[PDB]
Design a protein around this ligand. Structure first.
Ligand SMILES: OC[C@H]1O[C@H](O[C@H]2[C@H](O)[C@@H](O)[C@@H](O)O[C@@H]2CO)[C@H](O)[C@@H](O)[C@@H]1O
Ligand code: TSN
Ligand code: K
Ligand code: K
Ligand code: ZN
Length: 723
């Protein structure tokens, strides 16, 4: 930490060549330089940098660096004017933010039309030729064009062709409120891309690895990639040329030009050493050549070595595309921009969403991603007719919303309008028999309802009970549709009655329709395949209904922490035991952390999060996160006997946001202390809105730690993150 020097750089670059520079630096001064390449490190770095941890030196394109600087995660760079002249002036401007410098420039990288020179000696200079050109090749069992579709960076040069742009630039300023994502040029651009996939030319499944292996095996005429790719293309038995990007509507393609940059972490005590390595060991003709021999950097920022590299007709072709395109903005809103376009492209190019709809949703979130709120006051109609002392009261959801408005959190959200669940939605998790039974209760009276209520375990029914349960589930499904279509990033569904106890053909524990489960299955239908879903049930009671509903499903990872009391705590079974790991092909996808005894608190739940939940969750890698967010495990709750603070819930929430690219949906379950649940829900909503987690306090209970490790033992043979 003070005697070392660790550096991060993306896996597509030449990290091995950088290690060699770290070896010729370790030998010179004695300091060991370790270079690792984490996945999704542009997301990983701002996580650790905030909480003091992280690498000494960060490597990435300049577009992300302004976000890091706005959070004060980067150290200010102070090079003398002598070294300043050593690079091109336009590269320094890319890493200049709010006056200060915040990174060392390394190389300029722009996309190019790499193409096979054998199967296709003449590269089409227009995008419009490609479908016809694919016809002539698809007969010979060969494709025409394949490139990465899972990242918006690769399809952007086509979107920007006819007039699409991110944020408008005038003078020195970027107008956050001026976005050209849903304008004609951008729409015409993506429309043409989707049509390629519409007509069986390109496949939507195509990613970086698939597309590279296709071109390298000589079964794809053209591809789109950066200088870094060239190295792998050489070893390949493929003769390749690099030229200008094809035109769209007679317009030159405009790729988003990026600059490979190196920043110093603010928490690094090794700053001076950081300055020494980057300036006098990396940014030299010798150092830059070491990396470039591994993977081509492109057009480097260093004047001396650039003159040598500029003889390359490929680098010249890289400069041609870069000049026709535009240099990426460094403003801290780029992260929200790239996520919007990523969602829009994936959605539209699949068939789920349309060009008009997808771009319209992205247009609204280029500046910042929104958080959705969904709630209906009519859900208060469901009430107990013979017992006013029952804890599941209509005041539960009102007190929450009323508190969200007091703190002004509700206004900072994008309030979604709910709707009843369609018959199809409910039939995915509940039988038509049980649904009909429950709808029949609508026209019963208090006497008939009493006998009807005694048919189930811990249930009260009133004439409104069907409309409310139908609304709670339908509301959560609306939230699903919102997140999965780029309307929001994450959201909260303040609803009642609860649902995680509801079985397929039976009501139980104040539940009728399992809203979380229906939402899970619903999410998989609108995507059209078995989407990977994570369900975290941090309610103080075990969600027996949810577990049984996905007991054999390996596409839905269900995690639950709850009072067990040796099978005595409600719902009273052994179904919530730690040894219950699901069955069949879903074995290992049912995780039960079972508490023995009361007073489980913050330190207890945080222990489980770091030792079990997060490792398993990350290995599972969900594409959507649903939370049975009951707050009866909270402090001051009359039923749960636990002491989790609102500050604690905020941390648990904020920690789960690193999953599924931040796609989370908190759906309310239990919680019966009006002040405790409204406070906890507010603290959670704060975390969802990007607000920083508060400070905390109180060692882990021993019996809790016993409980935790007890269930990792049973799961250690099904999860490598537990080994
Ligand atoms: O796809 C969005 C992505 O675009 C850019 O990332 C590039 C990067 O610049 C290249 O060096 C290489 O790693 O390909 C990446 C895309 O796969 C932006 O730099 C990045 O912020 C953004 O997420
Ligand atoms: C069903 C349940 C938990 C539900 C939940 O929160 N699921 O998530 C708790 C039951 C066992 C309970 O303890 C109880 C206590 C008092 C009471 N009245 C004073 C009316 C009614 C019920
Ligand atoms: K639970
Ligand atoms: K499961
Ligand atoms: Zn509960």
């Amino acid at each position: 930490e003070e005697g070392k020097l660790v550096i991060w750089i993306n896996g597509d670059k030449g990290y091995n060549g950088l290690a060699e520079v770290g070896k010729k630096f370790e030998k010179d001064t004695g300091i060991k330089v370790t270079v690792e390449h984490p996945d999704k490190l542009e997301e990983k770095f701002p996580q650790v940098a905030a909480t003091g941890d992280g690498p000494d030196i960060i490597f990435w394109a300049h577009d992300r660096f302004g976000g890091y600087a706005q959070s004060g995660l980067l150290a200010e760079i102070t090079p003398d004017k002598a070294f300043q002249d050593k690079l091109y002036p336009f590269t320094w401007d890319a890493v200049r933010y709010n006056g200060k410098l915040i990174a060392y420039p390394i190389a300029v990288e722009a996309l190019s039309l790499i193409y096979n020179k054998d199967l296709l000696p003449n590269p089409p200079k227009t995008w419009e030729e490609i479908p016809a050109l694919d016809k002539e090749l698809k007969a010979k069992g060969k494709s025409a064009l394949m490139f990465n579709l899972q990242e918006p960076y690769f399809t952007w040069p086509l979107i920007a062709a006819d007039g699409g742009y991110a944020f408008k630039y005038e003078n020195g300023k970027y107008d956050i409120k001026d976005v050209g994502v849903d304008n004609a040029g951008a729409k015409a651009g993506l429309t043409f891309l989707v049509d390629l996939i519409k007509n069986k030319h390109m496949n939507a499944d195509t990613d970086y690895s698939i597309a590279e292996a296709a071109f390298n095996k000589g079964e794809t005429a053209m591809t789109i990639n950066g200088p870094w790719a060239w190295s792998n293309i050489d070893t390949s038995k493929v003769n390749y040329g690099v030229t200008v990007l094809p035109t769209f509507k007679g317009q030159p393609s405009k790729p988003f030009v990026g600059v490979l940059s190196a920043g110093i972490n603010a928490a690094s005590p090794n700053k001076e050493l950081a300055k020494e390595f980057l300036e006098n060991y990396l940014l030299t003709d010798e150092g830059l050549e070491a990396v470039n021999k591994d993977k081509p950097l492109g057009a480097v920022a260093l004047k001396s070595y650039e003159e040598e590299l500029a003889k390359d007709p490929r680098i010249a072709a890289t400069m041609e595309n870069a000049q026709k395109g535009e240099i990426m903005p460094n403003i801290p809103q780029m992260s929200a921009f790239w996520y919007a376009v990523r969602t829009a492209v994936i959605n539209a190019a699949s068939g789920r969403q349309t060009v008009d709809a997808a771009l319209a949703a992205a247009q609204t979130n280029a500046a910042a991603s929104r958080t959705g709120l969904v709630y209906d006051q009519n859900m208060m109609n469901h009430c107990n007719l013979w017992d006013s002392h029952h804890p599941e009261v209509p005041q539960r959801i009102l007190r929450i919303m009323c508190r969200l408005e007091e703190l002004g959190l509700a206004g900072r959200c994008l309030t979604l309008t709910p709707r009843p669940a369609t018959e199809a939605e409910l039939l995915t998790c509940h039988s038509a028999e049980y649904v009909g039974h429950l709808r029949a209760t609508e026209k019963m009276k208090t006497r008939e309802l009493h006998r009807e209520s005694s048919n189930f375990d811990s249930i009260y029914i009133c004439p409104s009970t069907f409309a409310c349960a139908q609304l709670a589930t339908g509301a959560a499904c609306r939230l699903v549709e919102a997140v999965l279509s780029g309307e929001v990033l994450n959201g909260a569904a303040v609803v009642r009655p609860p649902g995680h106890h509801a079985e397929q053909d039976a009501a139980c524990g104040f539940c009728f329709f399992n809203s979380v489960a229906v939402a899970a299955r619903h999410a998989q239908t609108i995507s059209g395949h078995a989407l990977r879903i994570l369900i975290v049930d941090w309610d103080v009671h075990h969600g027996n209904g949810t577990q049984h509903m996905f007991e054999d499903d390996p596409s839905v990872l269900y995690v639950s922490l709850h009072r067990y009391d040796h099978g005595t705590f409600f719902p009273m079974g052994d179904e919530g035991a730690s040894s219950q790991i699901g069955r069949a092909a879903g074995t290992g996808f049912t995780v039960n952390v079972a508490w023995n005894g009361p007073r489980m608190g913050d330190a207890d739940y945080l222990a489980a999060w770091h030792r079990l939940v997060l490792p398993i969750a990350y290995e599972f890698n969900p594409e959507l996160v649903l939370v049975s967010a009951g707050f009866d495990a909270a402090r001051g709750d009359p039923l749960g006997g636990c002491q989790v603070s609102p500050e604690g819930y905020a941390h648990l929430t904020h920690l789960l946001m690193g999953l599924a690219s931040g796609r989370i949906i908190l759906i309310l379950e239990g919680g019966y202390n009006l002040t405790s649940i409204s406070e906890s829900m507010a603290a959670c909503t704060r975390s969802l809105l990007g607000d920083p987690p508060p400070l905390l306090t109180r060692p882990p209970l021993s019996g809790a730690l016993a409980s935790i490790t007890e269930t990792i033992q049973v799961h250690r043979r099904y999860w490598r993150s537990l080994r």
